[PDB]
Design an enzyme around this catalytic site. Sequence first.
Site, PDB file in Angstrom:
ATOM      1  CD  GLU A  35      51.733 -37.663  20.396  1.00 41.19           C
ATOM      2  OE1 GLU A  35      50.660 -37.607  19.765  1.00 41.19           O
ATOM      3  OE2 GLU A  35      52.120 -36.746  21.157  1.00 41.19           O
ATOM      4  CG  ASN A  46      44.936 -32.157  15.639  1.00 37.87           C
ATOM      5  OD1 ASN A  46      45.757 -32.184  14.782  1.00 37.87           O
ATOM      6  ND2 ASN A  46      44.977 -32.913  16.666  1.00 37.87           N
ATOM      7  CG  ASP A  48      44.080 -26.999  14.016  1.00 34.06           C
ATOM      8  OD1 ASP A  48      43.868 -28.179  13.663  1.00 34.06           O
ATOM      9  OD2 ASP A  48      45.237 -26.539  14.134  1.00 34.06           O
ATOM     10  CB  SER A  50      45.735 -29.773  11.504  1.00 28.62           C
ATOM     11  OG  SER A  50      45.774 -29.988  12.906  1.00 28.62           O
ATOM     12  CG  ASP A  52      48.260 -34.890  15.366  1.00 26.49           C
ATOM     13  OD1 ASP A  52      48.668 -33.898  14.740  1.00 26.49           O
ATOM     14  OD2 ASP A  52      48.025 -34.870  16.596  1.00 26.49           O
ATOM     15  CG  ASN A  59      49.188 -30.774  13.362  1.00 24.24           C
ATOM     16  OD1 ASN A  59      49.133 -29.649  12.870  1.00 24.24           O
ATOM     17  ND2 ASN A  59      48.120 -31.400  13.844  1.00 24.24           N
TER      18      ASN A  59
END
EC number: 3.2.1.17
Length: 129
Positions: A35, A46, A48, A50, A52, A59
């Site tokens: 990660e 991301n 969309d 959003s 992380d 998220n």
Amino acid sequence: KVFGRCELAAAMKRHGLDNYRGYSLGNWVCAAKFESNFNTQATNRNTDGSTDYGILQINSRWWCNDGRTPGSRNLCNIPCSALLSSDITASVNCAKKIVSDGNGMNAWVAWRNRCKGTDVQAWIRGCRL
Ligand SMILES: [Cl-]
Ligand SMILES: [Cl-]
Ligand code: NA
């Protein structure tokens, strides 16, 4: 902060991730490896919209507030910035919520694709724990 592997393992242990939801410590260390490369300051945007955040890439779509994820929730009740801290407490506590959300560690795509089913012992090899 970029954690060493065993350093992170010890911290995750201390905060109660070993066996949390039945997931052995090596799972969590492997997830953080893929990660964030063990970097507390890691971020990722991301598709969309959003983002992380942190060593487990929490998220903004559900778990923290960053003020720029329309229609999003803050179920961990904390600013996403608090997840970039050198101290991992906020990230762990929030990870506990996430892994309890129904699909276990499959909530971390990278865990499913890179850690699940593998030799995740190995992630805590040599570590005085
Ligand atoms: Cl393990
Ligand atoms: Cl599960
Ligand atoms: Na949010």
